[PDB]
């Protein structure tokens, strides 16, 4: 759950942080690791693509499943760890053949569980099933967009998904923000919503702590110069004169539903509620 | 002692008899696993319906009786596996004395 530090300084006042009560060990294996860089938003061409990144502690990749093509083999699960990469905690893998990897953690994974990834798996949280073997009502993640792959839909900590109604082709699926589309019927996914919850309920407190994360402080709009952002200048404080307030690259920033108008998914999507 | 339970489920009529026997075999074999005791397996009535339920105005009524310790897993296993199959329309479990 959430710790609350007793107020010692004036900066440690409004602090909140997790417990990490549900982590067994913290000495991961060799083979699943990979190294990394920090691009700091900079290309091959040495220029800042997207602002406000970089400058923090070291991290590494790990190799996490998204396909689960090994089927009809019982999967022993032993430990749940923490990874620097993703908001959600992650768990090791043991196969009875003897192959090891990492797998995401829904709510309710335990030590000594045995998950099944085949098309005939018993319907429990953590199992992997092609979508046609799944009835209506469950909660399903690592939802494949296009088969072969793996997960590209919902991954991060918390959020859920539903199944509204089958057709022949395609399958209806309700995502977050209540926006429901057509998704193919030969896709592989995993049952159950994501694990950790309380990342909506953790403060940062210091400038230093979000700087421990790989971020960077910005600058306000009209606080910019009268050239490098179009609001700028102003004598004293001034309200915005250029109506419908503007990003530094044109593109006003209140209410532009701006997908490409002729995309090849537009004939598959019902009820864009809230974005 | 233990409890006594009627279980009367409503089957699709459009299935075969082989599917009917297979379904009876399947639920009987899975219910005996959690310490439930088989008593009797009656096919109640090929009966129609006073109003429609999902896609039918008929169905099959099959009742079984079963004794089990109250706090085993021989109830909620069936409760989980009943309403996920297609060939079960409705069902009810009542304590029996």
């Amino acid at each position: 759950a959430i710790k609350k530090y007793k107020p010692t300084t004036n900066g440690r006042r409004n602090m909140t942080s997790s417990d990490f009560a549900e982590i067994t060990t913290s000495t991961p294996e060799k083979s699943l690791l990979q190294p990394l860089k920090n691009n700091a938003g900079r290309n091959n061409n040495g220029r800042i693509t997207v602002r406000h990144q970089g400058g923090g502690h070291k991290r590494q990749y790990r190799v996490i499943d998204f396909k689960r093509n090994k089927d009809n083999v019982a999967a022993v699960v032993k430990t749940i760890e923490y990874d620097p990469n993703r908001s959600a905690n992650i768990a090791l893998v043991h196969y009875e053949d003897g192959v090891k990897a990492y797998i995401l953690a829904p709510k309710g994974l335990e030590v000594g569980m045995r998950l099944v990834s085949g098309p005939e798996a018993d319907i429990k949280v953590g199992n992997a099933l092609p979508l046609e073997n799944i009835p209506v009502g469950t909660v399903i993640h690592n939802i494949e967009m296009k088969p072969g792959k793996g997960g590209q839909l919902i991954r991060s900590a918390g959020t859920s998904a539903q199944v509204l109604g089958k057709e022949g082709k395609y399958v209806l699926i309700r995502l977050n923000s209540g926006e429901v589309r057509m998704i193919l019927a030969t896709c592989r996914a995993t049952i159950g919503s994501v694990g950790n919850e309380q990342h909506e309920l953790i403060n940062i407190g210091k400038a230093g702590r979000s700087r421990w994360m790989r971020k960077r402080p910005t600058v306000r709009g009209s606080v910019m110069n009268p050239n490098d952002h179009p609001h700028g200048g102003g004598e004293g404080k001034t309200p915005i004169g250029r109506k419908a307030p503007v990003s530094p690259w044109g593109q006003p920033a209140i209410g532009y539903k701006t997908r490409n108008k002729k995309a090849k998914s537009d004939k598959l999507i019902v009820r864009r509620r809230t974005k | 002692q233990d409890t006594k339970y009627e279980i009367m489920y409503i089957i699709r009529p459009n299935i075969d008899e082989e599917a009917k026997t297979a379904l009876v075999e399947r639920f009987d074999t899975i219910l005996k696993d959690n310490g439930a005791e088989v008593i009797e397996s009656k096919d109640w009535e090929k009966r129609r319906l006073a109003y429609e339920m999902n896609g039918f105005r008929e169905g099959i009524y099959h009742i079984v009786n079963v004794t089990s310790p109250s706090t085993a897993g021989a109830i909620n296993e069936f409760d989980r596996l009943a309403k996920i199959n297609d060939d079960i329309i409705r069902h009810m479990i009542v304590k029996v004395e």
Binding site: - | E6, I10, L49, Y51, R90
Partner: protein, 66 residues
């Protein structure tokens, strides 16, 4: 001065018996009150719960003038 359901020895209703199920519904399908039934006060509760079991599994409909 009024009849009762115990001469026929009512002991256990068992959820299905049309021979007593049909006796105490209305014509439209309502419940006959104990002004009209002539029965024991606990039997009101027995048969009320008995026909509320009946209205799920199709063995008696809710609304019927058709």
């Amino acid at each position: 001065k009024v009849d009762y359901i115990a001469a026929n020895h009512i002991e256990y209703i068992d959820y299905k018996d049309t021979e007593l199920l049909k006796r105490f519904i209305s014509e439209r399908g309502k419940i006959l009150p104990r002004r009209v039934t002539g029965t024991g006060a606990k039997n009101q509760r027995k048969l009320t719960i008995a026909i509320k079991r009946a209205r799920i599994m199709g063995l008696l409909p809710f609304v019927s003038d058709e």
